[PDB]
Design a protein around this motif. Sequence first.
Motif, short mmCIF file in Angstrom:
data_model
loop_
_atom_site.label_atom_id
_atom_site.label_comp_id
_atom_site.label_asym_id
_atom_site.label_seq_id
_atom_site.Cartn_x
_atom_site.Cartn_y
_atom_site.Cartn_z
N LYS C 29 -62.84 -2.94 26.64
CA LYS C 29 -62.53 -3.28 25.27
C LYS C 29 -62.81 -2.12 24.32
O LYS C 29 -63.58 -1.20 24.61
CB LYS C 29 -63.31 -4.52 24.83
N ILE C 30 -62.15 -2.16 23.16
CA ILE C 30 -62.43 -1.25 22.05
C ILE C 30 -63.29 -2.02 21.07
O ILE C 30 -62.99 -3.17 20.73
CB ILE C 30 -61.15 -0.75 21.37
N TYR C 31 -64.37 -1.40 20.60
CA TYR C 31 -65.24 -1.99 19.59
C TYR C 31 -65.15 -1.18 18.31
O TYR C 31 -65.32 0.04 18.32
CB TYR C 31 -66.69 -2.07 20.07
N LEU C 32 -64.90 -1.87 17.20
CA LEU C 32 -64.69 -1.24 15.91
C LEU C 32 -65.80 -1.72 14.99
O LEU C 32 -65.92 -2.92 14.73
CB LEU C 32 -63.31 -1.56 15.33
N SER C 33 -66.59 -0.78 14.49
CA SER C 33 -67.72 -1.05 13.62
C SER C 33 -67.43 -0.54 12.22
O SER C 33 -66.47 0.20 11.99
CB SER C 33 -69.00 -0.40 14.17
N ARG C 34 -68.26 -0.96 11.27
CA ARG C 34 -68.08 -0.50 9.91
C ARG C 34 -68.39 1.00 9.85
O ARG C 34 -69.13 1.52 10.69
CB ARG C 34 -69.01 -1.26 8.97
N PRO C 35 -67.81 1.71 8.89
CA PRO C 35 -68.12 3.13 8.75
C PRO C 35 -69.60 3.35 8.53
O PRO C 35 -70.23 2.69 7.71
CB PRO C 35 -67.30 3.56 7.53
N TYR C 59 -64.43 9.56 6.04
CA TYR C 59 -64.76 8.14 5.97
C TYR C 59 -64.16 7.48 7.20
O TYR C 59 -63.00 7.07 7.21
CB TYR C 59 -64.24 7.52 4.68
N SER C 60 -64.97 7.38 8.25
CA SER C 60 -64.48 6.97 9.56
C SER C 60 -65.49 6.04 10.23
O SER C 60 -66.68 6.06 9.93
CB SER C 60 -64.23 8.19 10.44
N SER C 61 -64.97 5.22 11.16
CA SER C 61 -65.64 4.22 11.98
C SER C 61 -65.81 4.73 13.41
O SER C 61 -64.95 5.45 13.92
CB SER C 61 -64.85 2.91 12.01
N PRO C 62 -66.89 4.35 14.09
CA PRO C 62 -67.04 4.75 15.49
C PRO C 62 -66.24 3.84 16.41
O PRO C 62 -66.16 2.62 16.19
CB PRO C 62 -68.55 4.59 15.74
N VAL C 63 -65.63 4.44 17.42
CA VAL C 63 -64.82 3.71 18.39
C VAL C 63 -65.51 3.82 19.74
O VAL C 63 -65.78 4.93 20.22
CB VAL C 63 -63.38 4.25 18.45
N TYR C 64 -65.82 2.68 20.34
CA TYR C 64 -66.45 2.62 21.65
C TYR C 64 -65.49 2.06 22.70
O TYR C 64 -64.74 1.13 22.43
CB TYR C 64 -67.71 1.76 21.59
N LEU C 65 -65.54 2.64 23.90
CA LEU C 65 -64.69 2.21 25.00
C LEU C 65 -65.58 1.93 26.21
O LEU C 65 -66.21 2.85 26.75
CB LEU C 65 -63.64 3.27 25.32
#
Lengths: 52, 48, 78, 84
Positions: C29-35, C59-65
């Motif tokens: 899955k991809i996890y999208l968190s607040r910036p 101004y960016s969010s971290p993306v986890y795989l």
Amino acid sequence: FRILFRKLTREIYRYMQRCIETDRDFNLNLAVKSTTITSGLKYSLATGNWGE
Amino acid sequence: LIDTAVKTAETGYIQRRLVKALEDIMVHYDGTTRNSLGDIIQFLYGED
Amino acid sequence: EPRLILDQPAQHTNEKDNINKRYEIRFGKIYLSRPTMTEADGTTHAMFPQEARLRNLTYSSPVYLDMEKSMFTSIDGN
Amino acid sequence: ELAILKEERTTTPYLTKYERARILGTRALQISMNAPVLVDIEGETDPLQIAMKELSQRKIPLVIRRYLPDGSYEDWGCDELIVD
RNA sequence: AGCAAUAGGAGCUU
DNA sequence: CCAAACACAAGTGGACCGTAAGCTCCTATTGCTTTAAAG
DNA sequence: CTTTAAAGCAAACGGTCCACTTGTGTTTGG
């Protein structure tokens, strides 16, 4: 993102060619160079040149 | 607007080529119209 | 392109002993968190557009795989 | 050798616009370089206007050498060309 | 008494 | 006078080079990554 | 065991010019 993530997966392959030779367990947190997607997106959005 | 924007480049190119073709042509003191090679273009300027 | 595959079947200066060895990783899955913002100290906190504008940040969010590496060996992750 | 005798001079007897302009410029530069002035200086201090007064009174000491297209030339003193 | 370059983009007047 | 093979003539396909003038501002980038050597 | 310096490495349509192909003509030699 497709271009840059295929770049990243090629990097993962180019790391798993070497490290697996050592025959060790690896935690994959040194196998992903996160700076590739970040630098690519930032370069394209900051210059406008849409591509590598 | 497109015509005004687009024909001016062709016109400027045409005028540059005409100037380069005719840039070396002068009326000389004997009345003749010669280029830089000394070749005669007209024996009298404007024929008058 | 959901799979990578390494392979080596045999003939690496062994005693004729052959094993098929596939190394493989599975993206999840991809996890999208607040910036978020990370300082040179290493402290983190929420990031808002005005702070990103003032400090010349992105101004960016971290993306986890998620990755789950699997192996199969036939003789013939957070 | 390339000079033309004063009898067979077949160019115009009139000072042209380019000859007049360059002659005036050169005379103005000369007078502005503390050259002697041939006319009687009454009121004017601009070297160009002094040069114009000298040109009108035919008292500018210069020579125009008019080159022909074959390399030969004719010599005309400014005082013998006619100024309009 | 000494103020980089190269690119891209948006514009001005014809 | 006539047969012929090679001396001699064009028709044809597909290479390069160039596309108005002047001006303003802003913004980003100026090589990067991996391996080897020395302290 | 860590830092610095040097070297090497990726995946638009028109037209002047040049000679190869197609073609025509000679004039030796019987």
